[PDB]
Each structure stands twice: as structure tokens, then as C-alpha cells.
A paper describes a structure:
To improve binding to PCT64 bnAbs and rescue binding to PCT64 LMCA, we combined the enriched loop sequence from ApexGT1.B, the K169R mutation from ApexGT1A, and two naturally occurring mutations from the PCT64 donor, M161A and D167N (Landais et al., 2017). ApexGT2 also showed good thermal stability by differential scanning calorimetry (DSC), with a Tm of 71°, reduced by 6° from MD39 but still within the range for BG505 SOSIP.D664-based native-like trimers (Kulp et al., 2017; Sanders et al., 2013). Position 187 within Loop2b was not glycosylated in MD39 but was well occupied in ApexGT2 and composed mainly of complex-type glycans. The conformation of Loop2B in both apo and PCT64-35-bound trimers, and the lack of clear map density for the N187 glycan, both suggest that the tip of the loop is predominantly oriented away from the 3-fold axis and that the glycan itself is highly flexible, consistent with the N187 glycan having negligible effect on KD.
Broadly neutralizing antibodies (bnAbs) to the HIV envelope (Env) V2-apex region are important leads for HIV vaccine design. HCDR3s for these bnAbs mediate binding by reaching through the conserved glycan shield to contact a positively charged, semi-conserved protein surface on strand C of the V2 loop (Andrabi et al., 2015, 2017; Gorman et al., 2016; Landais et al., 2017; Lee et al., 2017; McLellan et al., 2011; Pancera et al., 2010, 2013; Pejchal et al., 2010; Sok et al., 2014).
Numbering used by the authors:
A (entry chain B), D (entry chain B), E (entry chain B): 518 to 544, 570 to 662
B (entry chain A): 33 to 57, 82 to 143, 152 to 309, 312 to 323, 323A, 324 to 397, 399, 412 to 457, ...
C (entry chain H): 1 to 52, 52A, 53 to 82, 82A, 82B, 82C, 83 to 100, 100A, ...
The structure:
């Protein structure tokens, strides 16, 4: 039930421990320790900025309007959520995360403009 | 009617100062941006000045400090075939040096340049080193070169460096062709006085830059559009010897010279130099009158460090007399030989409390470099003389095209959209 | 001169389908919202559908809401309407019109600036 | 299409590149470099805090309930979005941004209290 | 009307100055000053992360689905909002804030899963 305890569990089980890991992301001699702390903050903020760009700010589970390409993975839901742990899944689609991230950004950019014109 | 709408990620910036970081061993055009540039108010110059000095000082921290050598030296004339130009330039000096053991002494003789020693009590056998009354000399480490390796300056996130691509830009005012760069080009921290060596050339024409051109208290930086090649040499074969003056502490000195003793000098093609000045004169006449007289003259005064062309040639420090380059009046395969003095005890930056000993280099020295600009001062008939004592001018000549701005991504504007 | 030319269909059976299209010229197509306005043979004008200049937002009159699709192609300057289930009550002249909406950073419309001549759609 | 590429373009064109600039806001000798990094983070967080205060957290385009005073600018939409680049606009209303920011804060404070009393 | 000016006022009065305090949370010799600045940022981010975990990201007043246990405090609304300043209130329930924080996290975790299955 602690940090990374679910690392060996199935994706559908591990997805219930997202707050366990989220809370462990934040907290001349002594300078390299400041560099490590500053860097940890910068890393954290980049992931948070990215979620904001995709329209997922403030949440751990975020649904989008980006469809899945089976060229990315053609496994079904029982193969992915009831087997392939998150470590296994990450390896399998590592080659596609930049394509997916680009498509999440493009979608949010269309959504924010369509919503401003409906408030007009 | 209209409502305030907030936008974040807006392509807006304001002038700003910050700390730039190094990068040592990418460009966006910004199609309709006109920006105001102002070299001389460019803080990138001040940062480079402080960083170069700091790195220089850091490199001397682990080197031998020559305090055992602040002793009386007994100096006589060198028993060799010294030409007229070199009479009095070298002295053969004897002294009692410390050794690796505290209760032992050794007798050492070495050759010193006359510029590095001073008589005591006006006595002609007893001399001391120049700095014994003001400072401790530190010997530069023989394993560390003085080569001006290029440095790039990069902006921190939230900041950007803008670059002026206008080929006729004179350092100030609007620049119609501006791009954004991540980091500057590599700039070589070449340290020299009146002639700028190994810098960037103007793309089309000689460019004359001055903070206030009619103000005779200001320096004029002249960028050439063609290099002038200058060949410098110290035509003497130096035998370098060393002694231990302490526990693992070695002092390096010239023991002797093999063969005849001749003066160090630099060669500038006569024809190339005359073409170069003609171009400079044509451009000066655009700020000064057209039916005028432009006269070049030698530096008016001050110490050797400012009345000569100072540079590092293969590790040795040369002080060349440029009166042969700046002696002409322009009214409406020969070369010029410039005599050079050599010093081992130098102060580098315009400072009082530091001094460095440059150990001698074994053999015969030759170096070739490009003159890429001049530093001039001004007194009908206008007279121009060499200047350049302040190193910040050398760096202004490379950094003039860059500006640092801060990005201001948040802003508002009216729209027909309401919450 | 702005021209909108309908090049759609004619006679269709009840319960069938018919697609209309309109070619635009003389203006920047992509700068304007467009709509379809219908006129039954013996009646006045009725608004049927509206589409955004970027093609992302569509609006319909309730009577065709689950049956008609309005679309746009900004590369080919083409407006189109796909009609399904075609009731006898859908017989009308269908006019291609420019207007009915703006994009928040533009002055508003809420009127129709340009009209085509209209395709006659007959359901028998 | 890169960072600040749209700086010379019209406001209505430049507004489509907001993610390009947003992503370039985040990433004794060596101390002044830490000071620069810490400062960059602090600057970033102040702008993000301010958007949160105004009720614009998590978005690049945010519509509000604050009306425009034509005393701030009396130009119409074609003058502002189809000419005056963002650099030009920023100069023109620089004198009014603190008034506008204060009014955005006051509005959000009334909105959050009206919404808590409707959930009661 | 300045920072902490409302500290001696009633909870229902002090709750109207939340932006006054929120804006004052952000901004070898010189190293201890960097440590103080880095630490201030880390503290700030932990409180913001915690609000996000509870589903309160981007707001100063956040209503939840967690009921009040009167074992935590059995005072009524007039006792709490028209007397007990925030300093007094904080002392009275200090023993219960970890229980309450845990219950806020558990609730948000159920809410995000119930909302993803309704979008399916
Ligand atoms: C203007 O630019 C030119 C072109 O770059 C520059 O000329 C170069 O100067 C360097 C330094 O004097 C020369 O490099 C040396 O060449 C000799 C001959 O082969 C070598 O023996 C040297 O190696 C010894 O010394 C090093 C320390 O300096 C040690 O690290 C090394 O282990 C050896 O002991 C060294 O390689 C270079 O050859 C010339 N280049 C040309 C084309 O002549 C000139 O100096 C610049 N001018 C100014 C004022 O900066
Ligand atoms: C600079 O120019 C002088 C000529 O004025 C060169 O001197 C000659 O050098 C050659 C050897 O290469 C000798 O044979 C000649 O006798 C020298 N002439 C005179 C008048 O002394 C000198 O070598 C040139 N420079 C540099 C920098 O190497
Ligand atoms: C500097 O002076 C010393 C003497 O004080 C010179 O060295 C002597 O040279 C003669 C030959 O002329 C030898 O017989 C002696 O034994 C040498 N003495 C020592 C102590 O080595 C030295 O050559 C002179 N230096 C230069 C560059 O001329
Ligand atoms: C460079 O050489 C010139 C000579 O060619 C030196 O100029 C002379 O300076 C003295 C003063 O010390 C004057 O009395 C002479 O009239 C000058 N000569 C000429 C021809 O004008 C000059 O001082 C030297 N500069 C350096 C830095 O050594
Ligand atoms: C799905 O992907 C198909 C193939 O795209 C190519 O292969 C994938 C693995 C990536 O490497 C991608 O960069 C390549 O272009 C597309 O042909 C297909 O249209 C995509 N489906 C979409 C986007 O509708
Ligand atoms: C989900 O997939 C199960 C496994 O399918 C088989 O093995 C995988 C690894 C692939 O090679 C696939 O092509 C094979 O057919 C099926 O047994 C199961 O019925 C599927 N479930 C559903 C609802 O379709
Ligand atoms: C719009 O502004 C009018 C004038 O306000 C004054 O001038 C502007 C430029 C600012 O400097 C402001 O501080 C000055 O008070 C107001 O008279 C008018 O009421 C305002 N409109 C509103 C708020 O409804
Ligand atoms: C938008 O404004 C256009 C320009 O108006 C004129 O020039 C500006 C700079 C001011 O001085 C203004 O008072 C002048 O009248 C008009 O040509 C255009 O029609 C206006 N558009 C709309 C929809 O009103
Ligand atoms: C309310 O709390 C009741 C007592 O809980 C206990 O006392 C409080 C003060 C805490 O110390 C807590 O850890 C103890 O368990 C519960 O019996 C009651 O069920 C709670 N109400 C709920 C959760 O419905
Ligand atoms: C709110 O509570 C007021 C005070 O109640 C009394 O004093 C507190 C400190 C406790 O000891 C409590 O048990 C006492 O009864 C009441 O006067 C007031 O009527 C209450 N208001 C409402 C709406 O119930
Ligand atoms: C490890 O696998 C077993 C089945 O072999 C399963 O019962 C157990 O829950 C798994 N462990 C974790 C952390 O999921
Ligand atoms: C693993 O995958 C298969 C489908 O491939 C699925 O039937 C099963 O539920 C998954 N998990 C288990 C329990 O083996
Ligand atoms: C991923 O990319 C590698 C090459 O980098 C390739 O060999 C592999 O087949 C790709 N497929 C996967 C694992 O999705
Ligand atoms: C030095 O000059 C004299 C006079 O010309 C000459 O006799 C002597 O040989 C020269 N010395 C050397 C080492 O050649
Ligand atoms: C030594 O050299 C100087 C020139 O600097 C000269 O005046 C002096 O007479 C010389 N002395 C002897 C003994 O040769
Ligand atoms: C070196 O020491 C000797 C005595 O051993 C002395 O005669 C000589 O003058 C000293 N040399 C100097 C330069 O003082
Ligand atoms: C050292 O002595 C020289 C004279 O030889 C003099 O000019 C200089 O000012 C003195 N330095 C100090 C620090 O007194
Ligand atoms: C540099 O250019 C500006 C702008 O045209 C001009 O005002 C200034 O006098 C020029 N200065 C020099 C030295 O050319
Ligand atoms: C430039 O120098 C002249 C003197 O030559 C002076 O009168 C003028 O005020 C100076 N201009 C500026 C901007 O400093
Ligand atoms: C300099 O002296 C060395 C011996 O140390 C010799 O090998 C070299 O050829 C000499 N060079 C010249 C130019 O005399
Ligand atoms: C400098 O040396 C080069 C060869 O390295 C030669 O071609 C050139 O003519 C020389 N320049 C002068 C002024 O002597
Ligand atoms: C330099 O140029 C002037 C003017 O054209 C000319 O009179 C003079 O003879 C030239 N000198 C040389 C060395 O070419
Ligand atoms: C100065 O002379 C040049 C020719 O050398 C000519 O082109 C230019 O127009 C003249 N300028 C003035 C102000 O007379
Ligand atoms: C300048 O040149 C003349 C010859 O034209 C020469 O007599 C004079 O000595 C030179 N001046 C200097 C400082 O070299
Ligand atoms: C002088 O400039 C030319 C042309 O750019 C270049 O090829 C040459 O290497 C430069 N010389 C030196 C010493 O840098
Ligand atoms: C610059 O202006 C021209 C019109 O003169 C326009 O076509 C071009 O797109 C503009 N550049 C940018 C970056 O908007
Ligand atoms: C600039 O402003 C005018 C209104 O002042 C407007 O008609 C035009 O669309 C804008 N942009 C262009 C394309 O000039
Ligand atoms: C903005 O303020 C300045 C004074 O700071 C004033 O001169 C100017 O007229 C004001 N108006 C603008 C540019 O909106
Ligand atoms: C302090 O208490 C008095 C009543 O005794 C009240 O009027 C005043 O507003 C209170 N001060 C603050 C800051 O709330
Ligand atoms: C304090 O508490 C009582 C209830 O205990 C309530 O009647 C009153 O409104 C509160 N505040 C004041 C004004 O005393
Ligand atoms: C809080 O806890 C303390 C013990 O830590 C206990 O004495 C006190 O009664 C508790 N009750 C309060 C003040 O809520």
C-alpha cells in the first residue's frame, strides 16, 4: 500500500494508487544538493505544465478527444488493464509517446477556440 | 459590447538584465519585428568582462607563488652578440634562491628583460624585480595555455537573445531584420589593445561605431570588411631551465640564448595596410567633412601597456610600436616592420594588486593573426590616434549585435466572448 | 463580386437521401460562417442550419436536427448539406448563404450578407 | 513556427501559437546560475498564481465577466486583431494593466461566493 | 486591508481577504538565502498539490462531498463564523486535520472514477 507498491500489479489495479505516487514527487558542499532540489521542482513543473496544455490540469485521471491508433498498440482492454503492468506498457508504446503528446496538444487548442466562440 | 479576455503564451518581451550561462566545446527569423538596439548599454559586455577576469584568476590559484625570488639580484650586461636595437634590453642576473630544504640555498643566474627589473638606490649592479614593492608575483602554470578558446553565452528560460542581422548596422537604433537565438556565436576572448585581432569582419563595408562620434572623449571602434594579416616573431632561440624553490615548486627561467640577439617584431603588408586606411578614411568622411583632412598619428602618451599594441603571441607577451602604421595624412612586396618589446611580469587587467610571471617558452616563436578592426580616438584637420586600453571595447565589438529580453507571456485584450 | 453557386440535386423519393453542395468565390471563404435557408414553394424563408468558419461548430433547426449534416471544406471553397430520410415536408428551394455568425475576435453578424440562387429539392 | 516566430504577426494570428511560447518558459561559480533558475521558477509561479486568482487556471484563453472600458482603448476588433501585433498592443495599454488586473480579481471573488451559496 | 489585517477578525469576515494572503506566499554567503527561497517554493507547491488531490485546484473556496463529524467540532455556524477567528479555530481542530485530509483524498478518488465511467 506504499510508494510503488503497485508497480508489479496490473494497470487496472495500479491506477487506484495514483495519489500514493503523486505525493512522493515533492520532498562548495551543499550546492549539489540545491541543484538536485531545484531540478526536482523544475521537473515537476514541466509535467504539470504539460497536463495543463492538454486540458488535464488538476486531475489524476483525464479523458480526452484523441482516438487511439491501433498502429500504436493493437491489444484489447483485457490484455492491457488485466495484464501488462504499467512498466510493461511503458516499454511497448515508448516509441509513440511524442506522437500522442502532440495530438493531445492539437486537440486542446481546437477545444479552447470552439468554446470561446460559443461564449460569443 | 466587449469583454476582457486573458491570454497566456503571448509573444511579447521587454528589455531586461539577467545572468547568462556558458556553453563551450537554434535561430528563428521573426519576420516583421523591428527592434531597438543599443551597444554601450548592453549588459552582456559587463558580464563577459567579469567572467573572463574571474576565470583568469581561478587558473592561477594552484600555481607557484614567487615570493622566494624577492631578493636582490646582481645584474651585468649579457655576453653575446646583441644588435643595436637590443642594447640594454637584457640583463644577466645572479641571485641566492631557496631550495626544497629550508636550510639550503642555491646560486642561480638567469636572463631578464630590462622592463621586468629596477635598480635599487640607482646602483648598476643591484636590481630587484618590478613588483617586489607592490605585490607578490604568481607564476603562470606551464601546462595551462593562454589560447582564447570560444565561449557562447546562453539565456536562461524565460529570457531570449535577439540578434540584429542588418549588415549595415552601426550598434544603435532600430534594426529591421531581427532573429531570435538560443545562444550567441562563439566569441574568442582575445585580449589586445589598439588592433583587434581574430574577430568578426564586416559583411560589406568598413563600419565605424562610436557612442557619440562628435565627442572626442569617446572611442571609435572600426570594424574592417577585410582582414589585414600580421606576422609576429621573437627570432631568438631560448634555452629554458628550471630550479626547485620549494617542496615541489619549480621556477622557470631563460638560462641562455643560442646565437645572436635580435629584436622581436611584427610585419604588416604595406599595400594592404594603405588600402585599409583608405577605406577607413572614406567612412570617417561621412561623419566629418568631405573636403577635409584626415591624419593618423601615433599614441600620445601613457605607459607601455597603452602606447603599444599589446598581445599574447604563442604564450609570450609582446608590446609593439605601431607608429609605422599610423603615420600618414589623407587630404581630400614591401612590409612595415613594427619593433616589439617582451615582458615576463604583467598586470593583464587594469589592476594594481596582482601580477603574473609568464615563464619563458623554449625555442623560437612565430604567430600569424588577422587585424579585424581598430580602436581609435580623436584629438580644419582631424587627427586620429590608436586607443584600446579598456578590454570592454574588445568585447563590445563582438556583442554589439545581441540583446537580452525577458518574455512577458501574460496579457489581455477585448473580445466579444463573456464568461 | 461574391458568388455562391448551388450545384445540388433535384427529385428524390421520400425516405431517401440527397446531398447539396455550394461553390464559393469572390471572398475569403474561410473568414465567414455559412448557413442554409429553406423556402417551401408557397412559403417564406426558414433557417435550417449554420456552420462555423473553421467547420467545428454546427447548429440545426429542431425539425432536421437528427437528419441533416452541414459541412465545410475550406481548401475547396465548398459548403455542403447531407440530408437523410427526406420527408415530403422537406420540399423547398435551399439557398446557400453567407453569414449568421462570427468568431469572437470579429465584429458580429447575426444576419445573412450573401445569397446563392438556390437548389430545388423535391421529395415525391 | 518556432518560439516568438509570430511576434511580428497580427494578434489574431499570434493567438494561435500560445503553446509555443508557454513551453519555453520552463527550462562562488555556479551560484549565480542557481539564482537564475530559482528566479525563473518564482516568476513562472507568480503568473500561474495570478491566473488562478482570476479564475483562469489551467487554460491559455480565458473569458471573464469584466467589461472593457473604452477609456483603456477605444479601438474596434478589426483594429486590434487584424492589425496592432501583441508588442504594439502591450505598449498602448501598459498604463491600464494594473486597473484591469484589480478588476479581474474583484470579479472572481464575487463569483466564488455566489457559487458556494447556490450549492447551499 | 493589508496582509494578515483580518487575523483578529471573525472567520466570516476574514474569508473575504483570501487573495490578500495568497499573493504574499510567493516573493558561503548567499547560500542560506537560496535555501530559503527554494524551500518557500517547495512549501507552496505542496499546498497546491494537496488542493489538486482533493479536487480544489484553481480556487480559494472549495466545497466538497465530505460531511462534517461533530466529533471534530460540535459548534454551530454562528459560533464558528460569527465568533472563533481563524487562529482560534485552527487550535480547536488541529488534532483532526489529518483525518479530514485523508477523507478529502478518498472522496476525490471515488469522484474521478465515477466520472470516467459516465463518459464511457
Ligand atoms: C589568431 O588565430 C591564429 C589561428 O588560430 C592563432 O595561431 C595559432 O596559435 C597557436 C598557439 O600559439 C598555435 O598552436 C601551437 O603550434 C605549435 C607548433 O606546432 C605547437 O608546438 C604548440 O603546442 C605546444 O604548446 C601548447 C600550449 O600552447 C601545449 O598544449 C602543447 O602540448 C605543446 O607543448 C601549439 O599546438 C597554432 O599552430 C597557430 N595556428 C596557425 C594557423 O598558425 C593566433 O595565435 C591567434 N592570435 C591571437 C592574438 O590570439
Ligand atoms: C619581416 O620583414 C623583414 C624584411 O624587412 C624580414 O627579414 C628578412 O628575413 C630573411 C629570412 O627569411 C633574411 O634572409 C633577410 O636578410 C631579412 N632581411 C632584412 C632586411 O633583415 C623578416 O623575416 C620578416 N618577418 C617576420 C615576422 O618573420
Ligand atoms: C651569465 O654569467 C655567467 C657567469 O656568471 C655565464 O656562465 C659562465 O660562462 C663561462 C664561459 O664563458 C664558463 O666557463 C663558466 O663556468 C660559467 N659560469 C657558470 C656559473 O655557469 C653565463 O654564460 C652568462 N649568461 C649568458 C646568457 O651569457
Ligand atoms: C615608437 O617609435 C617612435 C620613433 O619612430 C617614437 O617617437 C619619438 O618619441 C620621442 C619622445 O620620446 C620624440 O622626441 C621623437 O621626436 C619621436 N620620433 C618621431 C619620428 O616622431 C615613439 O615614442 C615610440 N613609441 C613607443 C611606445 O615606444
Ligand atoms: C494511424 O497511423 C497510421 C500509420 O502512421 C504511421 O505509423 C505510425 C506507427 C507512426 O509511426 C506514424 O508517425 C506513421 O505516420 C496512419 O496511416 C493512420 O492514418 C493513423 N490514423 C489516424 C491518424 O487516423
Ligand atoms: C481480447 O484478446 C484475447 C487474446 O487474443 C489473442 O491473443 C493476443 C495476444 C493477440 O495475438 C490476438 O490477435 C489473439 O486473438 C481474446 O482471447 C479475447 O477474446 C479478446 N476479448 C474481446 C472482448 O474481444
Ligand atoms: C471607465 O473609466 C472612466 C474614467 O476612469 C478614469 O480614467 C481611466 C483612464 C483610469 O485612469 C481610471 O483610473 C480613471 O478613474 C470612469 O469614469 C468610468 O466610470 C469607467 N467605467 C466603468 C468602470 O464603468
Ligand atoms: C473599425 O474601425 C475602422 C477605422 O476607423 C477610423 O480609424 C480609427 C483609427 C479611428 O480614428 C476611428 O475613429 C476612425 O473612424 C473603420 O473603417 C471600420 O468601419 C470599423 N468597423 C466597424 C464594424 O465599425
Ligand atoms: C465520527 O467519529 C466517530 C468517532 O471517531 C473517533 O473519534 C474521533 C474524534 C477520531 O479520533 C476518530 O479517529 C475516532 O475513530 C466515529 O465513531 C463515527 O463513525 C464518525 N462518523 C462517521 C465517519 O460517519
Ligand atoms: C447556536 O449556539 C448558541 C450557543 O449555544 C450554547 O453555547 C454553546 C457554546 C454550547 O455550549 C451549546 O451546547 C449551548 O446550547 C445558541 O444560543 C443558538 O441558539 C444556536 N443557534 C441555532 C440556530 O441553533
Ligand atoms: C502478484 O501476482 C499474484 C498472482 O500470481 C497476485 O495475487 C498478487 O496480488 C500480485 N501482486 C501485486 C502487487 O499485484
Ligand atoms: C489478460 O488478458 C486476457 C485477454 O488477452 C484476458 O482474458 C484476461 O482477463 C487478462 N487477465 C488475466 C486475469 O489473465
Ligand atoms: C519501437 O522502435 C524500435 C526502434 O527504436 C523498433 O525496433 C521496435 O520494433 C518498435 N516497436 C515497438 C516495441 O513498439
Ligand atoms: C660575435 O661577433 C664577433 C665580431 O663580428 C665575431 O668575431 C664572433 O665570432 C661572433 N660570435 C659568434 C658566436 O659567432
Ligand atoms: C652595459 O649596457 C649599457 C646600455 O644599457 C651601457 O650604457 C653600459 O656602458 C654597458 N656596460 C658595460 C660594462 O659594457
Ligand atoms: C649570494 O650569497 C653570497 C654569499 O654566499 C654573496 O656574496 C652574494 O653577494 C649573494 N648574491 C646576491 C645577489 O645578493
Ligand atoms: C615602487 O617603486 C617605483 C619606483 O621604482 C614607484 O614608481 C612605485 O610607485 C612604487 N610602488 C609602491 C606601491 O610604492
Ligand atoms: C548610428 O546610427 C544612428 C541611427 O541612424 C545615428 O543616429 C548615429 O548618429 C550613428 N552613429 C555613428 C557613429 O555612425
Ligand atoms: C554628443 O557630444 C556633443 C559634444 O561633441 C554634445 O554637445 C551632445 O550633447 C552629446 N549628445 C549626447 C546624446 O550625449
Ligand atoms: C634551437 O635549439 C635546439 C636545441 O635545443 C635545436 O635543435 C634547434 O634546431 C635550434 N633552432 C634554431 C632556429 O636555431
Ligand atoms: C605572413 O606569412 C605568410 C605565410 O605564412 C605569407 O604568405 C605572408 O606574405 C606574410 N605576410 C607578411 C606581411 O610578411
Ligand atoms: C596610399 O594612398 C595614397 C592616396 O591614394 C597614395 O598617395 C600613397 O602613395 C599610397 N601609399 C602606398 C604605400 O601605397
Ligand atoms: C562626399 O563625396 C562622395 C564621393 O567620394 C559622394 O558620393 C558623396 O555624395 C559626398 N557627400 C556630400 C555630403 O557631399
Ligand atoms: C612619418 O613618416 C616620415 C616620412 O614621410 C618620417 O620621416 C617620420 O619619422 C615618420 N614618423 C614616425 C613616428 O615614424
Ligand atoms: C583570416 O581570415 C581568412 C578569411 O576569413 C581565414 O581563412 C583565415 O584563417 C584568417 N586568419 C587567421 C589567423 O585566423
Ligand atoms: C509580415 O507581413 C506580410 C505582409 O506584408 C505578411 O504576409 C506576413 O505573413 C507577415 N509575417 C508574419 C510572421 O506574420
Ligand atoms: C486593420 O484595421 C482595419 C480597421 O481599422 C480593418 O478593416 C482591417 O481588417 C485590419 N487589418 C487589415 C487586413 O488591414
Ligand atoms: C500612458 O501614460 C503616459 C504617462 O506615463 C501618458 O503620457 C500617455 O498619454 C498614456 N496613454 C497611453 C499611451 O495609453
Ligand atoms: C475588533 O473587535 C471590534 C469589536 O470589539 C470590531 O468592531 C472590529 O471590527 C474588530 N477588528 C477586526 C480586524 O475585525
Ligand atoms: C457568536 O456566537 C453566537 C452563537 O453562539 C451567535 O449568536 C453570534 O451571532 C456570534 N457572534 C456574535 C455577533 O456575537
Ligand atoms: C486534542 O488533543 C489533545 C492531546 O494532544 C487533547 O488533550 C485535547 O483534549 C484534544 N482536543 C481538542 C482541543 O480538540
Amino acid at each position: 500500500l506504499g510508494f510503488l507498491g503497485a508497480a508489479g500489479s496490473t494497470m487496472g489495479a495500479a491506477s487506484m494508487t495514483l495519489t500514493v505516487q503523486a505525493r512522493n514527487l515533492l520532498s562548495h558542499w551543499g550546492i549539489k544538493q540545491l541543484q538536485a532540489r531545484v531540478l526536482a521542482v523544475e521537473h515537476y513543473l514541466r509535467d504539470q505544465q504539460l497536463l495543463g496544455i492538454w486540458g488535464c490540469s488538476g486531475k489524476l485521471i483525464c479523458c480526452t478527444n484523441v482516438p487511439w491508433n491501433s498502429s500504436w498498440s493493437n491489444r484489447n482492454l483485457s490484455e492491457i488493464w488485466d495484464n501488462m503492468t504499467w512498466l510493461q506498457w511503458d516499454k511497448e508504446i515508448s516509441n509513440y509517446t511524442q506522437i500522442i503528446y502532440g495530438l493531445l496538444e492539437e486537440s486542446q487548442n481546437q477545444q479552447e477556440k470552439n468554446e470561446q466562440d460559443l461564449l460569443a | 459590447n466587449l469583454w476582457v479576455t486573458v491570454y497566456y503564451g503571448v509573444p511579447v518581451w521587454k528589455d531586461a538584465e539577467t545572468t547568462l550561462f556558458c556553453a563551450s566545446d537554434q535561430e528563428i527569423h521573426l519576420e516583421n519585428v523591428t527592434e531597438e538596439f543599443n551597444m554601450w548599454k548592453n549588459n552582456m559586455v559587463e558580464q563577459m568582462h567579469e567572467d573572463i577576469i574571474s576565470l583568469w584568476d581561478q587558473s592561477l590559484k594552484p600555481c607557484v607563488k614567487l615570493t622566494p625570488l624577492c631578493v636582490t639580484l646582481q645584474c651585468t650586461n649579457v655576453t653575446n652578440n646583441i644588435t643595436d636595437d637590443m642594447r640594454g634590453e637584457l640583463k644577466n642576473c645572479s641571485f641566492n634562491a631557496t631550495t626544497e630544504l629550508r636550510n639550503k640555498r642555491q646560486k642561480v643566474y638567469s636572463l631578464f628583460y630590462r622592463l621586468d627589473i629596477v635598480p635599487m638606490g640607482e646602483n648598476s649592479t643591484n636590481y630587484r624585480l618590478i613588483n617586489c614593492n607592490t605585490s607578490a608575483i604568481t607564476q603562470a602554470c606551464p601546462k595551462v595555455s593562454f589560447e582564447p578558446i570560444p565561449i557562447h553565452y546562453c539565456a536562461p528560460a524565460g529570457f531570449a537573445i535577439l540578434k540584429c542581422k542588418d549588415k549595415k548596422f552601426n550598434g544603435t537604433g532600430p534594426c529591421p531584420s531581427v532573429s531570435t537565438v538560443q545562444c550567441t556565436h562563439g566569441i574568442k576572448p582575445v585580449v589586445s589593445t589598439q588592433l583587434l585581432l581574430n574577430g568578426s569582419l564586416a559583411e560589406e563595408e568598413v563600419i565605424i561605431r562610436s557612442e557619440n562620434i562628435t565627442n572626442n572623449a569617446k572611442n571609435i571602434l572600426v570594424q574592417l570588411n577585410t582582414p589585414v594579416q600580421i606576422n609576429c616573431t621573437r627570432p631568438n632561440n631560448n634555452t629554458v631551465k628550471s630550479i626547485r624553490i620549494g617542496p615541489g615548486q619549480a621556477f622557470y627561467y631563460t638560462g641562455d640564448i643560442i646565437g645572436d640577439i635580435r629584436q622581436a617584431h611584427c610585419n604588416v603588408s604595406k599595400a594592404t595596410w594603405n588600402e585599409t586606411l583608405g577605406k577607413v578614411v572614406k567612412q570617417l568622411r561621412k561623419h566629418f567633412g568631405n573636403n577635409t583632412i584626415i591624419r593618423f598619428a601615433q599614441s600620445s602618451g601613457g605607459d607601455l601597456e597603452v602606447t603599444t599594441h599589446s598581445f599574447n603571441c604563442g604564450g609570450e607577451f609582446f608590446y609593439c610600436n605601431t607608429s609605422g602604421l599610423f603615420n600618414s595624412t589623407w587630404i581630400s612586396n614591401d612590409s612595415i616592420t613594427l619593433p616589439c618589446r617582451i615582458k615576463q611580469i604583467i598586470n593583464m587587467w587594469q589592476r594594481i594588486g596582482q601580477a603574473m610571471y609568464a615563464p619563458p617558452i623554449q625555442g623560437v616563436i612565430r604567430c600569424v593573426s588577422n587585424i579585424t578592426g581598430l580602436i581609435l580616438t580623436r584629438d580644419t584637420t582631424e587627427t586620429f590616434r590608436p586607443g584600446g586600453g579598456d578590454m570592454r571595447d574588445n568585447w563590445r565589438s563582438e556583442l554589439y549585435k545581441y540583446k537580452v529580453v525577458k518574455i512577458e507571456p501574460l496579457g489581455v485584450a477585448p473580445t466579444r466572448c463573456k464568461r | 463580386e461574391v458568388q455562391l453557386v448551388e450545384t445540388g440535386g433535384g427529385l428524390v423519393q421520400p425516405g431517401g437521401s440527397l446531398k447539396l453542395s455550394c461553390r464559393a468565390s469572390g471572398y475569403t471563404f474561410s473568414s465567414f460562417a455559412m448557413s442554409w435557408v429553406r423556402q417551401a414553394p408557397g412559403k417564406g424563408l426558414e433557417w435550417v442550419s449554420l456552420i462555423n468558419d473553421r467547420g467545428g461548430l454546427t447548429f440545426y433547426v429542431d425539425s432536421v436536427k437528427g437528419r441533416f449534416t452541414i459541412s465545410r471544406d475550406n481548401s475547396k471553397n465548398t459548403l455542403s448539406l447531407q440530408m437523410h430520410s427526406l420527408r415530403d415536408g422537406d420540399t423547398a428551394v435551399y439557398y446557400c448563404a453567407t453569414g449568421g455568425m462570427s468568431s469572437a475576435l470579429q465584429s458580429s453578424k447575426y444576419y445573412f450578407d450573401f445569397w446563392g440562387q438556390g437548389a430545388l429539392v423535391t421529395v415525391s
